[PDB]
């Protein structure tokens, strides 16, 4: 009972990062060397899951409380909030937004992360939210630290939060990373620079949002997300 009633604006694959971006070393062997094959949109591509009736835990969006082992996590208390809209400026309500990040010191709670910065016993780094009826989402967390990684000999990721957004169809689904206003690591990072257009990079930088802060409590950052434009089919 999903139906094919919409078309999605075609992706600009020179706005998005290309597959082969050699300064990001792992892309060299994990990039297709043949051209993508274009296919017309059908019901297979223009539909996708709606998560309205996924049962969320009370603290699923609140990383200061969702890994509570006897206290608060250490680090910069922040709210991360924004609106999900499409390219026509239409809000995208009831859509699933997932995020994960390192702790205040750049350490992830994953067995493969052996960075010597310690884990925080009251931090897990995972959140999820559904956008509300006007397309807005919000998380509460701590600002993640940068961290070193085995790319070049002295490469460091800017502070960042990973994001996944479902949107109305599998055609709109997006994984990205949020960076923080002013971070001097941003222009140096080969993963940021997988995006060739500097104006596109700017779209991933969250802005300090004093208006959304809780005085004497937590700061706030704003990160708006734009998914592919959705229109009705016409003249098919």
């Amino acid at each position: 009972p999903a139906q094919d009633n919409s078309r999605f604006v075609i992706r600009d694959r020179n706005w998005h990062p290309k597959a082969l971006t050699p300064d990001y070393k792992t892309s060299i062997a994990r990039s297709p060397r043949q051209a993508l094959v274009s296919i017309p949109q059908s019901i297979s591509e223009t539909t996708g899951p709606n998560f309205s009736h996924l049962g969320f835990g009370a603290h699923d969006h609140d990383l200061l409380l969702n890994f509570n082992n006897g206290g608060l996590p250490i680090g910069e208390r922040i709210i991360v909030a924004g609106r999900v809209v499409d390219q026509y400026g239409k809000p995208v309500p009831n859509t699933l937004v997932e995020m994960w990040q390192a702790n205040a010191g750049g350490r992830y709670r994953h067995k493969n992360d052996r960075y010597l910065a310690p884990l925080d016993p009251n931090f897990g780094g995972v959140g999820r939210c559904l956008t509300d009826s006007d397309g807005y989402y919000s998380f509460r967390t701590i600002k993640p630290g940068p961290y070193p990684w085995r790319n070049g000999p002295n490469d460091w990721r800017p502070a960042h939060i990973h994001f996944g957004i479902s949107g109305p169809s599998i055609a709109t689904k997006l994984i990205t990373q949020l960076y923080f206003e002013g971070d001097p690591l941003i222009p140096m990072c080969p993963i940021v620079k997988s995006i060739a257009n500097p104006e596109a990079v700017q779209q991933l930088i969250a802005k300090l949002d004093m208006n959304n802060a809780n005085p004497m409590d937590c700061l706030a950052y704003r990160f708006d997300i734009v998914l592919r434009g959705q229109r009705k089919t016409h003249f098919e």
């Binding site: 892309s27 994990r30 835990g57 026509y88 400026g89 994960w100 997006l174």
Partner: protein, 200 residues
Amino acid sequence: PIELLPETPSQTAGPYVHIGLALEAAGNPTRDQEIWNRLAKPDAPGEHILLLGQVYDGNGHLVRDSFLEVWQADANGEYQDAYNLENAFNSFGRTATTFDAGEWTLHTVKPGVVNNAAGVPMAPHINISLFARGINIHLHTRLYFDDEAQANAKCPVLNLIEQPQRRETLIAKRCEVDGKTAYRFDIRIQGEGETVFFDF
């Protein structure tokens, strides 16, 4: 020309994608409801199948940190978008390759036929999106079935692949795992046998 707001650009999922999107596969505690790899409960209509596969890089080496999202019609050829863990069937799932388990698995039913926008039937297929470290924007592919040869030969999507040899990369191989019907679908990101990836 008319220029709309630009789409937020993609970035790699990175090596720890599993802590956010595949909690069990990451060896971390799960929440009460997770979106995972069992699309069909045992009572769901249709032919119950196991899907499995491995993911290879351009040097022929296993990708042990893949994250995969799948979207498929039910046995009756209808997409079920109302995701609910109480449903006998959900059209959407997730799976992963990890260091412990290099082979992903899905538990589903064989999808029914669905028509394209011009009304021409497509051969039974599963839509797949592949994410990982080193993949800057996810790769879209389709899994078709080697026991649907007649339907596959007439699929209008398959037929957009100019070379027959490349069409073979999207055809999953039927086998049996523990007496149950299974299909193996390996994905080669780059080089010899490179899997067809789509744009739409």
